[PDB]
Write a protein that binds this ligand. Sequence first.
Ligand SMILES: Nc1ncnc2c1ncn2[C@@H]1O[C@H](CSCC[C@H](N)C(=O)O)[C@@H](O)[C@H]1O
Length: 431
Amino acid sequence: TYFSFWNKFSSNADINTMMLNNNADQLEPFDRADIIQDLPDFTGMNVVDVGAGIGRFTTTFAQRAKHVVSSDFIDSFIEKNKERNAAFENITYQVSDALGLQVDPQSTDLVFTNWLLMYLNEQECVRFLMKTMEWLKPGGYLHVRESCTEPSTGKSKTGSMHSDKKANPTHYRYSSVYLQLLKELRWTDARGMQWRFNVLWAKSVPTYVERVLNWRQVHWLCVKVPAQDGGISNEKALISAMGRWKIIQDHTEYLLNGKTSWATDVINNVISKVDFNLPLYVYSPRVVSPFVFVDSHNIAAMTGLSVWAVETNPLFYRHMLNRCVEAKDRRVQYGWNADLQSSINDWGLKKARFGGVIATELFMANSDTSLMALKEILDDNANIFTIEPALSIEDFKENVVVPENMEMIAITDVSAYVVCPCWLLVHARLL
Ligand SMILES: Nc1ncnc2c1ncn2[C@@H]1O[C@H](CSCC[C@H](N)C(=O)O)[C@@H](O)[C@H]1O
């Protein structure tokens, strides 16, 4: 049982236990800062911290929040929580299972969790997510962070508090399973309106990339938004979907493992000629083929620059996280976003800038408005290289809209190089 697994740490109510890591003091302040800085401004918010343990995130929320409900099902973690946070007067405490937490409906601006769904069975996962829908105001936020595929301490097990003599009951699910669950969930309120989670992004916690070489500490930020259309509303269908999504992912690995991108020869060649201080932005949606993508690890090895790469298909995003763990190149990080605009939205809010773009199907896959918005996250006169499928140069040139703030300086037939159909290398620059 998960309660007895955690209750046995009752006398170790400390940071090591919260991260199940004997070296947590090398990680905790950086992990906390990574998570906090990706959250919305929670000044004046009603926050709910579920599975809070001793309350390390509650300590930070209390500085600015209107109110924090801080909850956990281990009584002595809440006792240490109250002791550590005794100076604050804006925190109420509940010893409760996440599922039995009492929160008023439409009362909460942020439901915050960090390592929780991995301690719930599939049925409990779904029921809990539906509880957060009920607690959240419209436009409210849900934060989820989970250990995907393997424990946070990774294969080395260095510093892990998991006993080698006892089984570990934790569920280490695929990041693509949680992502689809959040994407497809639907909930109907007491007045008959249906809602969904707008999943703003999926990201790896950088502290664990940098210090643990673990890209599979994945977290998500979601907004509760109206949804007349549906994904899956039935709880039992949602439960079954989680198993189907795992199977589909296993077949994606079987298909993709060890296959190099058909675009790799062209990209290596031109990028070997170009000089791009800033990270590079990589975008790979894989619209026409699962085998046409940007090899970010080759970009980083050749340019020496850090790379932020976006995959918009949850299955391919998860596969590239696998590749990151295998390559162990800290310069490369992957993210998931619904589309280009979602990525621009996030990075623009951070006022981040990228030194150039290397993409496949950037024009094939994206609206005119989003391509026009891309300048918001790019350095001045940044250059964009994208491999585009087309019927012909004339087909492409007709009915492609060049954003007013850039110009295409080359549309080169590279069809003979993108092979196991017409492929164009489009070279553009910001004006
Ligand atoms: N079903 C459940 N309901 C409430 N708390 C739970 C729970 N399952 C696990 N927990 C608690 O969730 C915590 C996971 S360890 C993570 C603690 C905290 N979120 C942090 O990041 O620092 C533990 O404190 C454990 O006791």
